[PDB]
């Protein structure tokens, strides 16, 4: 399996209610390991996974100074974009930012990403080759020029291709207990008779990690995709995940349908019929 | 370990 460390920053303005609320959270793969909350007491970046309390104060001071930097950038940017878009300081506006880095099974750098968003829509984003930007608007061009002039791309790449994947290796190596595990799904199929004619076949997958899993139905062997339902993978709470897929079938034909489960924690895919 | 490279708009 491959791995990735990502950081998600959100900043929502509050007119008349003081400074905008800032929240930053960090993930390694699907496990959250740090957070910050401008309304919280400590005013300091907290841990959220045991293997990151391993760090001394040299580190926690840093991610606190750095996250306060992100915070006071988004603080200004909200006022900047409000002017960019000629909006009044009466509505609440939302700035988001995302960056991280992926590695292969050999933990070598694979791809990076950094990208910005205003009020739920794209704004600016590093190009996949990490050497130039894609502005989504006429306004974002002004940002693009500003950042082209400061060589920001040449420095986020340096962080993305270097420091980012090193600390990901550190993070994976420190928490090889948790981040490198592979919990396979505890699969089963339930059967709910709707009427005298149709019957619902629900195919569950509970308590697994990582969460990239694939559920599929197959009538007579070839893929069935009509009359199906597929809920979004959901967090259990204990750091595992749950997901199911249903299919509605005519009475008596239950055995024609087979659910197929694919996971990195599975040698070869599981297949389930009704019984 | 997040980046230190944050700039304005």
């Amino acid at each position, epitope marked *: 399996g491959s791995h990735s460390m990502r950081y998600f920053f959100t900043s929502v303005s509050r007119p008349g209610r003081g400074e905008p609320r800032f929240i930053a959270v960090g993930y390694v793969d699907d496990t959250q390991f740090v957070r910050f909350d401008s309304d919280a007491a400590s005013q300091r970046m907290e841990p959220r996974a045991p293997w990151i309390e391993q760090e001394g104060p040299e580190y926690w001071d840093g991610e606190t100074r750095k996250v306060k930097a992100h915070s006071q950038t988004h603080r200004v940017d909200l*006022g900047t974009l409000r002017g960019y878009y000629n909006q009044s300081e009466a509505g609440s506006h939302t700035v988001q930012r995302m960056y991280g880095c992926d590695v292969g099974s050999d933990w070598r750098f694979l791809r990076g990403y950094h990208q910005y968003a205003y009020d739920g829509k794209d704004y600016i984003a590093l190009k996949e080759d990490l050497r130039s930007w894609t502005a989504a608007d006429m306004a974002a061009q002004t940002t693009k020029h500003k950042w082209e002039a*400061a*060589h920001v791309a*040449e*420095q986020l790449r340096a962080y993305l291709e270097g420091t980012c994947v090193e600390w990901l290796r550190r993070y994976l190596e420190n928490g090889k207990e948790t981040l490198q595990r592979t919990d396979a799904p505890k699969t089963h199929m339930t059967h709910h008779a709707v009427s005298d004619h149709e019957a619902t076949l629900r195919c569950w997958a509970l308590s697994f990690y990582p969460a990239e899993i694939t559920l599929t139905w197959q009538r007579d062997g070839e893929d069935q995709t009509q009359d199906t339902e597929l809920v979004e993978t959901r967090p259990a709470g204990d750091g595992t995940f749950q997901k199911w897929a249903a299919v509605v079938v005519p009475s008596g034909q239950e055995q024609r349908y087979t659910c197929h489960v694919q996971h990195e924690g599975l040698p070869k895919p599981l297949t389930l019929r009704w019984e | 370990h997040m980046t*230190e490279v*944050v*700039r*304005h708009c």
Partner: T-cell receptor
Amino acid sequence: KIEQNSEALNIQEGKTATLTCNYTNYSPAYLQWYRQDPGRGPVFLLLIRENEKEKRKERLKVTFDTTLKQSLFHITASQPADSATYLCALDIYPHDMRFGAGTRLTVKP
Amino acid sequence: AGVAQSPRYKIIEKRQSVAFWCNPISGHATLYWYQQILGQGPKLLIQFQNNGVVDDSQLPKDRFSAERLKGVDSTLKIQPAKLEDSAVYLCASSLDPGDTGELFFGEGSRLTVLE
């Protein structure tokens, strides 16, 4: 986290002046050098990015060592008109330009 | 064509008020107030980007206050001035930090606070 310059230098004409600027616990991506005269008012001189090394203008020779955490400023073929105090300045993200103290140069004729 | 600062020199007694006006380079979004004591280098007081505040955690709000209102010129007040406040007060305007992020300083406003 500090920013240390020199402490009161002076040289003869013709000889080239070297001013040093060391910083600790930082990471800038941009260095700048300024010249302030008695009578107030810093005036900008040179501006060097981290991936570059050595930038020259006229008689000015400035260097930026990312890993040494140090910048070196050179006036070559020094004139007595060059005598003033000289300021180092770092650019910390997002837009915090912090200044060192002065190194006062006096080029004796 | 120049960063304007008023007044050249200003004498005030202790507990008094004093206000320095500065007009930046035309079109510069970022304006800084810096304090420079006898021999030290400039230490930032407050920093604007347009009409908003970027950094003023260094600004002793006991006495100092400053705002840009229009996003253009700004004024820096001292109510009241302590005897430790005698210094040069520098105004500067810059564009985006980058290859053209140079700072543009005014002539300075020499404050002298007396017994």
